[PDB]
Amino acid sequence: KRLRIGITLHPYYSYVSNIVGDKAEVVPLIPAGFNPHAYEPRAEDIKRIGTLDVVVLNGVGHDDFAERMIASSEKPGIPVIEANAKVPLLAATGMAARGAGKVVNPHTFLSISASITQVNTIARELGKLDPANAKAYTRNARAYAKRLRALRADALARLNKAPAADFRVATIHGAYDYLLREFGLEVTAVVEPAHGIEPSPSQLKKTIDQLKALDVKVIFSEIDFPSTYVETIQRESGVKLYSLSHISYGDYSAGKYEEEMARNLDTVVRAIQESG
Ligand SMILES: [Mn+2]
Ligand SMILES: [Mn+2]
Ligand SMILES: [Mn+2]
Ligand SMILES: [Mn+2]
Ligand SMILES: [Mn+2]
Ligand SMILES: [Mn+2]
Ligand SMILES: [Mn+2]
Ligand SMILES: [Mn+2]
Ligand SMILES: [Mn+2]
Ligand SMILES: [Mn+2]
Ligand SMILES: [Mn+2]
Ligand SMILES: [Mn+2]
Numbered sequence: 001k002r003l004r005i006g007i008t009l010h011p012y013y014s015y016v017s018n019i020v021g022d023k024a025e026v027v028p029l030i031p032a033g034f035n036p037h038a039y040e041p042r043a044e045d046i047k048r049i050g051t052l053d054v055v056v057l058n059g060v061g062h063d064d065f066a067e068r069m070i071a072s073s074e075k076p077g078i079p080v081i082e083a084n085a086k087v088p089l090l091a092a093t094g095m096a097a098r099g100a101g102k103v104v105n106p107h108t109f110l111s112i113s114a115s116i117t118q119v120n121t122i123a124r125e126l127g128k129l130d131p132a133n134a135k136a137y138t139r140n141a142r143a144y145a146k147r148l149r150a151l152r153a154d155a156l157a158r159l160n161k162a163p164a165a166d167f168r169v170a171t172i173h174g175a176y177d178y179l180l181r182e183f184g185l186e187v188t189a190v191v192e193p194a195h196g197i198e199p200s201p202s203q204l205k206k207t208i209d210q211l212k213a214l215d216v217k218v219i220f221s222e223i224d225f226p227s228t229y230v231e232t233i234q235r236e237s238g239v240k241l242y243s244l245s246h247i248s249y250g251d252y253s254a255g256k257y258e259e260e261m262a263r264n265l266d267t268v269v270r271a272i273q274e275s276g
Helices: 010-020 064-071 113-129 131-156 177-183 201-213 230-237 256-273
Strands: 003-007 024-028 054-057 080-082 169-171 187-190 218-222 240-244
Touching (some): 010 024, 010 054, 010 113, 010 256, 054 064, 054 113, 080 113, 113 131, 131 256, 177 256, 187 201, 230 240, 240 256
Parallel strands (some): 003 024, 003 054, 054 080, 218 240
16 A cells, blocks of 8 residues: 556546545656657566556547556556446547448547546555545546536637638547537548558558548647658648647656647637638
């Protein structure tokens, strides 16, 4: 004792740290500065799972590497918190065609409302494991949710007018479908054919031709692990470029999620305000 809680992605470090405080230890599975899309399990990181009591998973497609790390560890039967067990999932593409047709968008963590649902699931499941700190977990979860709710409200407060009917939005990476739904907006197109997959020159050309035909106004690119082909899209479509954070780069911290979500929500507001 204390509880040793494993995490996979940076947003989950933030949720858990804000729920536990000093009552437990938040242990990242994979190193800081690693790209979760590129990550291939290492004996190094698999060997630390044996020191944990519970692992908090996204479990809906953004941390399959962790399910394999646990399976290859000293604790293959380690208690697991399915953080998205009560989150309604969007079925955004793709995962391609001749692999898996229509799948689930695993970026629930890039939503304020689905974040609050995840925070509540984690605080309840940790409460069941650590009954002595169940009250503190719940108190801290409610207070974190109030700050997440205020973050969204204060960002939307900056929006004078709703986007026009012709306001179409595209993204490089299919991470922002949940974020944009907070504005009542839909992503017209995703450039990546499947999650974390680079398009072929022919696939990129077809997409550029679709952004031009569909009159897409703005494109949301990556700050974290940027792509080489975004300037080609700029050079061929005449679409305005804005960048968003996937909350996957740098050091793990409690504040990281709310710091980067505030910047994301302000970038989306700036993109709307700059449409008129
Ligand atoms: Mn304990
Ligand atoms: Mn559990
Ligand atoms: Mn808090
Ligand atoms: Mn996707
Ligand atoms: Mn992703
Ligand atoms: Mn919508
Ligand atoms: Mn959408
Ligand atoms: Mn696609
Ligand atoms: Mn390419
Ligand atoms: Mn065309
Ligand atoms: Mn990019
Ligand atoms: Mn910290």
